Subunit: 104 residues, 4 copies
């Protein structure tokens, strides 16, 4: 169980539901993610979660189990995650650097 | 060249640069993306682009070529893209539905 | 319409079907991919397609339209794509280099 | 620490190295992955790992730490992971079903 800091952007969708509309599933998991003390930011194509590796990946796993507990039979997830040793950077720090450079 | 409407969230990074810091590359490509008439939204883990398939995928390809033109030798990209026939939904519509349901 | 060579690994899934089992959809799209003259390699988590950017992204777009034509209401796709200017490398060349180094 | 079975296809790349060529990094991590008792399958665009969630995500985290221990300053990873309650399916079972259907 590694504890390295990481930034993980997750996009989770249910497979096999009766409708192409899945906002119920997204809202369901988002509420669960916001209950965690880990910092998270919701956007249109997913949610960015930050913190120690084990806690972040642990939460995503719990969300899957939560989905299954709520009746969803299959969950498909895409995770973009990065770790680095040169500096500590939150999701907000990341966008702040870009925005600054763009206006320059 | 398909023209179906699509929502594509792209995360692009350069491989082989001399530094772990890549905000220069991100800012460079973001400015190029904002020059397009296609609707785009920047977030911490990528940029969401919407429009006809050929125009969206065409732009991403142009960004790659632009990166190479600017000296970057290798570009690695992750794209999450979806198409649907039941309704038209922009990236903003998508987050709006979730936010509403979350407060309900 | 960029024509830079690219290697794209695609994972495509249908959203809103009546079953968690989606092998019918996968088989359907795979047969369509094999009809293209572009080089493709199927694996457990997707299919790797190579060739000019416009032809590769064009095919993926056609697959989406094909899915919708076959009754699927929503398609979600994850694409990992890379371009580079230092050498030409097929998907097979890529795995060959790794395998060699592993035994060394 | 969830223990639900999962199939995870991982694509890991180093950011900030002095070369666009990263086969050394890939070979390095692959050897580390093969030391694990977890079932893994290497392909051109990544490696598919299967097993309990905590063990699989734990290994990926260890690979990141291993990369940093070996001098790599930044690691970027894309993970496609799925869980389901309707059946147990390995990566090989997954491709076997498709291949069968394709010839039918």
């Amino acid at each position: 169980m590694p504890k390295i800091f990481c930034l993980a952007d997750v996009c989770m969708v249910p497979i096999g539901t009766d409708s192409a509309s899945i906002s119920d599933f997204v809202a369901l998991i988002e509420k669960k993610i916001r209950e965690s003390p880990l910092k998270s930011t919701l956007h249109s194509a997913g949610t960015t979660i930050e913190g120690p590796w084990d806690d972040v990946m642990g939460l995503i796993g719990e969300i899957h189990e939560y989905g299954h507990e709520k009746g969803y039979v299959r969950v498909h997830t895409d995770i973009r995650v990065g770790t680095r040793t040169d500096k500590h950077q939150t999701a907000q720090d990341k966008i702040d650097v870009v925005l600054k450079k763009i206006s320059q």
